[PDB]
Design a protein around this nucleic acid. Structure first.
Lengths: 129, 93, 242, 110, 124, 143, 173
RNA sequence: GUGGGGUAACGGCCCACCAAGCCGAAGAUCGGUACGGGCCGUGAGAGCGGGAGCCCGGAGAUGGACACUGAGACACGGGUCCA
RNA sequence: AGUGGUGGCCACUAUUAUUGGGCCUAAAGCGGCCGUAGCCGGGCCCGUAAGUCCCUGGCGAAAUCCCACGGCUCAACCGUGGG
């Protein structure tokens, strides 16, 4: 049975781009998936992404630019404050400031870099590099 | 040679505290009596009302610090100052 | 285990409000009970021996105190463990030297020298209101002293109100109330040694004290416990406050 | 109706017990809590339960921990199982009783 | 030694072994068992902190009060009913809340003769 | 499948599993029940003072061939008797019958019998309070 | 609480490369023990640790400590007056070694050899600002090197001590 | 729980009655082990291990038991009893 | 002016695996299925705001630890100041 749309989606993206396809369709579409898809596209990892009204749960269509190396959803929603953030960068990224992470703060789903100056903690949701 | 920095008057005790430095480059450490007779000259104090406790010469240092006290009457030391620095200065046998 | 009260205090465990070399010696003088609390005051011997440096040894400080030269708020105190707390005025008339004990920004006590005109006024915060038989009202101050008034004038006093207290002959002088805009000096908390003016009074239920919002001279807004706020003037401080 | 200073309407009917905060002698001070009644078999006594999470350093997940509390239940409220109840610290009542119920927020039927 | 110490059992029935002895402050004292007599016998006891507790052991007089508020020093004939425990009433033992038979009639005692040293009651 | 449980509210099982399987470890079991500190004849003592009873030698394990000298020591502390290897060249002659001696573990694998000689656990250091190494070197004299 | 050693031993006593890299400096700088070299290595490592810690820190205390660190490094004469936090990572042991009292007093031409300078120092014959120090391991600041002269009470403050002319000729030579 | 006792003081701490409660598989009870903490050792750290050495809190005078006197004790250089 | 032997502890070890291990053939999936507690659970809207996050008041003693300065040649050690 399905348990988490997001991690399935990120694994879908990564596995589809290892072979290196062009258009990827994610079946279990939800709002949080779209809020996620905003972030890295704002960093230019993916091309266009859009929503298709299927009639059951909606589909998400994405074009892949061949930019991401690994994109995965950290499951156990670790809540992290601001000043200790570096302790997690060493756990999911290959180098100093390489790649990003996604946090669901009080103000919504959004990139980790933009949260440092916004000064907001929250729970880690996913990562990509 | 002895040169002063601190000359401070304690009027609750009516006593003068003198912190001074002795220049002794290359010669043995001066004794108590010598500096005792030295300070009293240009400070113009009564020798019996004047007492010295310590003169510390540091390692590898030619300038040594020293502290002396200068009272006014013969009973102030007998009352307030402890009994050692009269004997070490010879003021009490 | 322990069986009764103790008369000793290690130098290490001394209160953090004291400027004392902790590792100089093993032992320190135990403060006897007195006007203020342990966190608020210091033994007089440490004032004489360390802050003033008149006496190098404790024995001569004790001798001088026995001579009674030092006046504590206009009263000679020969004891060498007396606790001197906040806004107590220490006067030595032989030098004419008068100081007021005030908290540091770090939270330690320091001596602010003052002129002679300030040496006969002590501000006391009204810690509690009670009243005794004969319908005689009594006010317990923050420094552990007590004063008696009659029932008629009771509405002119409230807890936490400041009173300028002529300590030389025990005469009330003025009553500064606890109202918005009053000039206030902090005694404890992270905002210690601050002076500002009251803005808001945050009443708190469930045993939690009131919080007062104080704005500094430059307009910085902070908060502090009501007990920690000491009123010192209606609009401007009536005393020289660092 | 004598004030206790807690934001709640008193129980309607009054009780003659010397242990009712609204209608007795004992008073309310100290900590307050919210819990659920699970056992009320003995006389004028309740066993409220409170659920919460606990964090661990080594595994950084959560561990449910439970707290059972014995509060006195005066007749004016008459707590039953399935009810959400506000509890307050009191003076030592008995060997185990040290709390009292002061409000019923939702009845069992809710 | 009467020890008013910890219960030696846990609430869950678990046995507890005492990690420490009995301190002096935590011991109790003998029940008064105040009896009715033709005179008034009292004991003054030095207590914790140097205070004094007066304890009435024999009682011969009582303060019967009317609902209005007036008190009368009237004698005690016998005890009627002790709701606290039925053995006391037979033994002419007086405690708080007991019902006493006096010249006025029936009175309920609202005093602590083991601590107060006096007997005060309300006519019924 | 996936290593489990990974849940945010799974602390109890994630802890219990690890505690349980920490018993599958052997060194931790050896420590926490202290059975090293119950089977020991030396009762956790790197040294002990004993009396010698008789000198015995043992055959080296194959292919190593020779005669390894040693003695039998009953322990004055408690009374157990163990073998005690004697090092040094011709040192058996120096160690006599009924000698106060100081004995200490031989530092093999896990403290076992060192190298090519089996069974033994300990070696001698001082004989009648005199260090045996020098007596092998002949610098000192037995009292 | 028990006072701990201030220096770190090498992780392996018998690595050829590290052993010889030590030995070259021992012969060049002539220290009594490898303990001294290890102490100075640890002294460097403290600066390195502070630098790498501070470089990743965001806060007021971080910046304040950073400025204090830079200031005291410059005071020692290790760094230029316009150094930054990035160049400390390029520092070497020899930067510390040249600041040793023995090294500096030799580079003033006050001895014909490292060991001669060490002998003069340990025998209380070299003064700094009119004060005598008997520790060749001492590290000099950037505000005191000009005060490195012969001790006045020494016979070598006298310009015609027989070794003195040979010393000055070696300076010339 | 009701109503009482003794306590400096509330409390089954204790007493007379009334009723069947209380705890336990998320680990009761029983047993093993052990003064708790600030801290210390190691380690890049996650962490593992330890709590004697200095300070705070807890407790004990050979094992046990008990009073008096004192604001403060069941009292190391006060007292009484058994072994 | 240390240096060796031995015993206890951490690392070496990702041989305790949260970070971070394996279970076809090397120790290691129970013969199979059902099912309670527990754990993990579909999409959208509204509310609540317990967790979650930001700000702020009180509070976690001293001692130890990090850094600057100053004093004892320096150091260790001590104080002043910030953490």
């Amino acid at each position: 049975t399905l348990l988490d749309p997001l991690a399935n989606a990120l694994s879908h993206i990564t596995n589809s781009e290892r072979v290196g396809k062009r258009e990827v369709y994610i079946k279990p579409a939800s709002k949080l998936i779209g809020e996620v898809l905003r972030v890295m596209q704002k960093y230019g990892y993916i091309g266009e992404f859009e929503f298709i009204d299927d009639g059951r749960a909606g589909v998400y269509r994405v074009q892949l630019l061949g930019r991401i190396n690994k994109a995965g959803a950290i499951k156990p929603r670790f809540p992290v404050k601001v000043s200790e953030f570096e302790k997690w960068e060493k756990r999911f990224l290959p180098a100093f400031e390489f790649g990003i992470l996604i946090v669901s703060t009080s103000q919504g789903v959004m990139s980790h870099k933009e949260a440092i100056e916004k000064g907001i903690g929250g729970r880690l949701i996913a990562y990509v590099y | 040679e002895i040169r002063i920095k601190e000359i401070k008057e304690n009027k609750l005790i009516g006593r003068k505290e003198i912190y001074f430095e002795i220049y002794h480059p290359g010669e043995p450490t001066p004794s108590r009596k010598d500096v005792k007779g030295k300070l009293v000259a240009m400070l113009d104090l009564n020798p019996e009302t004047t007492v010295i406790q310590y003169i510390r010469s540091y390692f590898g240092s030619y300038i040594s610090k020293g502290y002396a006290k200068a009272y006014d009457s013969k009973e102030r030391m007998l009352y307030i100052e402890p009994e050692y620095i009269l004997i070490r200065d010879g003021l009490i046998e | 285990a322990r069986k009764g009260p103790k008369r000793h205090l290690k130098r290490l465990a001394a209160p953090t409000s004291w400027y004392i070399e902790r590792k100089a010696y093993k032992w320190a003088v135990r403060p006897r009970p007195g006007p203020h609390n342990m966190r608020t005051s210091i033994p007089l011997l440490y004032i004489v021996r360390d802050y003033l440096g008149y006496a190098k040894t404790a024995r001569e400080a004790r001798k001088i105190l026995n001579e009674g030269k030092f006046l504590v708020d206009g009263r000679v105190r020969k004891d060498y463990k007396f606790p001197v707390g906040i806004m107590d005025v220490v006067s030595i008339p032989e030098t004419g030297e008068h100081y007021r004990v005030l908290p540091n920004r770090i939270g330690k006590l320091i001596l602010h020298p003052i002129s002679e005109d300030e040496a006969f006024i002590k501000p006391l915060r009204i810690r509690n209101k009670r009243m005794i038989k004969g319908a005689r009202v009594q006010l317990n101050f923050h420094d552990g002293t007590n004063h008696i008034v009659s029932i008629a004038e009771k509405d002119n006093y409230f807890t936490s109100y400041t009173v300028l207290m002529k300590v030389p002959e025990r005469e009330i002088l003025e009553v500064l109330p606890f109202e918005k805009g009053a000039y206030v000096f902090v005694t404890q908390g992270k905002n210690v040694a601050r002076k500002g003016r009251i803005v808001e009074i945050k009443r708190f239920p469930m045993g939690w004290p009131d919080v007062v919002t104080i704005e500094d001279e430059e307009g910085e807004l902070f908060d502090t416990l009501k007990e920690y706020a000491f009123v010192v003037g209606t609009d401007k401080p009536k005393i020289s406050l660092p | 109706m004598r004030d206790i200073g807690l934001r709640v309407q008193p129980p309607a009917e009054k009780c003659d017990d010397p242990k009712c905060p609204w209608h007795g002698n004992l008073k309310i001070h100290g900590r307050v809590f919210e819990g659920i009644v699970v056992s009320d078999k003995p006389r004028k006594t309740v066993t409220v339960e409170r659920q919460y999470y606990f964090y661990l350093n080594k595994y950084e997940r959560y561990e449910l921990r439970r707290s059972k509390i014995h509060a006195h239940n005066p007749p004016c409220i008459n707590a039953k199982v399935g009810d959400k109840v506000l509890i307050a610290e009191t003076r030592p009542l008995s060997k185990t009783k040290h709390f009292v119920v002061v409000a019923v927020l939702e009845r069992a039927e809710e | 030694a009467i020890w008013q110490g910890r219960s030696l059992k846990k609430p869950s029935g678990g046995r507890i072994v005492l990690a420490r002895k009995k301190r002096k402050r935590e011991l109790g004292r003998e029940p008064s068992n105040t009896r009715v007599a033709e005179q008034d016998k009292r004991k003054i006891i030095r207590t914790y902190g140097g205070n004094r507790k007066v304890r009435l052991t024999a009682a011969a007089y009582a303060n019967v009060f009317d609902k209005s508020g007036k008190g009368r020093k009237v004698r005690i004939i016998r005890v009627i009913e002790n709701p606290a425990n039925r053995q006391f009433a037979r033994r002419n033992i007086i405690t708080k809340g007991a019902i006493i038979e006096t010249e006025i009639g029936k009175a309920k005692v609202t005093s602590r003769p083991g601590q107060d040293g006096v007997v005060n009651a309300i006519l019924l | 499948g996936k290593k489990a449980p990974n849940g945010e509210f799974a602390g109890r099982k994630l802890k219990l599993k690890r505690k349980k399987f920490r018993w599958s470890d052997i060194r931790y079991k050896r420590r926490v029940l202290r059975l090293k500190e119950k089977s020991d004849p030396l009762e956790g003592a790197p040294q002990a003072r004993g009396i010698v009873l008789e000198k015995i030698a043992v055959e080296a394990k194959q292919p190593n061939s020779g005669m390894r000298k040693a003695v039998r020591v009953q322990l004055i502390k408690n009374g157990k008797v163990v073998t005690a290897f004697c090092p040094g060249d011709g040192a058996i002659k120096f160690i006599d019958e009924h000698d106060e001696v100081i004995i200490e573990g031989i530092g093999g694998p896990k403290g076992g019998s060192m190298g090519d000689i089996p069974g033994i656990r300990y070696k001698v250091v001082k004989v009648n309070r005199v260090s045996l190494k020098e007596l092998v070197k002949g610098r000192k004299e037995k009292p | 609480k028990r006072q701990r050693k201030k220096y770190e031993t090498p992780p392996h006593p018998w690595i050829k490369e590290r052993l010889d890299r030590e030995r070259v400096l021992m012969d060049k700088y002539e220290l009594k023990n490898k303990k001294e070299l290890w102490k100075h290595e640890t002294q460097l490592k403290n600066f390195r640790r502070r630098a790498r810690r501070l470089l990743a820190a965001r806060g007021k205390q971080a910046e304040i400590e950073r400025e204090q660190l830079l200031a005291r490094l410059k005071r020692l004469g290790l760094l230029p007056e316009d150094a930054v936090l990035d160049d400390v990572l390029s520092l070497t042991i020899e930067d510390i070694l040249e600041r040793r009292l023995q090294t500096i007093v030799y580079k003033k031409g006050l001895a014909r050899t490292m060991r001669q300078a060490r002998q003069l120092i340990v025998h209380g014959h070299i003064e700094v600002n009119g004060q005598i120090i008997r520790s060749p391991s001492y590290l000099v600041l950037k505000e005191e090197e000009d005060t490195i002269t012969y001790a006045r009470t020494s016979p070598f403050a006298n310009p015609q001590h027989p070794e003195r002319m040979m010393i000055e000729k070696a300076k010339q030579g």
